[PDB]
Amino acid sequence: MTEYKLVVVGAGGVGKSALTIQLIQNHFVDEYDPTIEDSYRKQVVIDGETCLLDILDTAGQEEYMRDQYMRTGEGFLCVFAINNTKSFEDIHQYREQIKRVKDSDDVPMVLVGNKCDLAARTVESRQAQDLARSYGIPYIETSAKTRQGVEDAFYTLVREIRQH
Ligand SMILES: Nc1nc2c(ncn2[C@@H]2O[C@H](COP(=O)(O)OP(=O)(O)NP(=O)(O)O)[C@@H](O)[C@H]2O)c(=O)[nH]1
Ligand SMILES: [Ca+2]
Ligand SMILES: [Ca+2]
Ligand SMILES: [Mg+2]
Ligand SMILES: [Mg+2]
């Protein structure tokens, strides 16, 4: 019935779970409970096509078998937070991991700068645009808190999988 397997990766606390929960359940998770590995499914219409999204929400905390879960992914949301410079610097490492698990240099991906509602910005849009350009992928900013950009980020990833 047309299924897209999406995987959300990135450093601990950047908002991977909050983003996914906003997309699927339409509310903001205010508390921080570190994830091990969670799965969500939802039927949606994207550009006139009824499809099923299967979303894997992965651990960002080193302490919390991710590789095995990521293997099945068709597209990856690589998330950092715009007030967390280290999370941005670590994007390179997540992308390298994706390329290992997929054994390919051509994997559908979108770069996401989350927490754009916050004002303590240390990653400027232009820096992230440049990183995304070097990877040949789109950059999109989101806020799981306000819901701004959330649907756009996930639907953009579906549109990247369709170009593969
Ligand atoms: N202001 C604001 N807070 C956010 C946003 N997204 C997430 N948060 C907050 O940041 C904290 C961590 O969010 P969470 O979604 O659990 O992060 P995670 O990337 O899933 N963490 P982990 O890798 O450990 O599972 C929570 O307190 C959450 O409310 C956002 O867009 N804006
Ligand atoms: Ca809440
Ligand atoms: Ca491999
Ligand atoms: Mg989480
Ligand atoms: Mg600077």
From Swiss-Prot:
Glycosylation sites: T35
Effect of D117N: Loss of GTP-binding activity
Positions contributing to GTP binding: 13-18, 29-35, 59-60, 114-117, 143-145
GO cellular component, one term: ciliary basal body
UniProt-listed InterPro entries: P-loop_NTPase, Small_GTP-bd, Small_GTPase, Small_GTPase_Ras-type
Modified residues (S-nitrosocysteine): C116
Key words of the record: Acetylation, Cell membrane, Cytoplasm, Disease variant, Glycoprotein, Golgi apparatus, GTP-binding, Hydrolase, Isopeptide bond, Lipoprotein, Membrane, Methylation, Nucleotide-binding, Nucleus, Palmitate, Prenylation, Proto-oncogene, S-nitrosylation, Ubl conjugation
Effect on the protein upon substituting C116S: Abolishes S-nitrosylation. No stimulation of guanine nucleotide exchange
N-acetylthreonine: modified positions: T2
Catalytic reactions of this protein: GTP + H2O = GDP + phosphate + H(+)
Chain segments annotated as transmembrane: none
Recorded topology in the membrane: Lipid-anchor
Modified residues (N-acetylmethionine): M1
Impact upon substituting E37G: No effect on interaction with PLCE1
UniProt xrefs under NCBIfam families: small_GTP
Protein name: GTPase HRas
Species in which this protein is naturally found: Homo sapiens (Human)
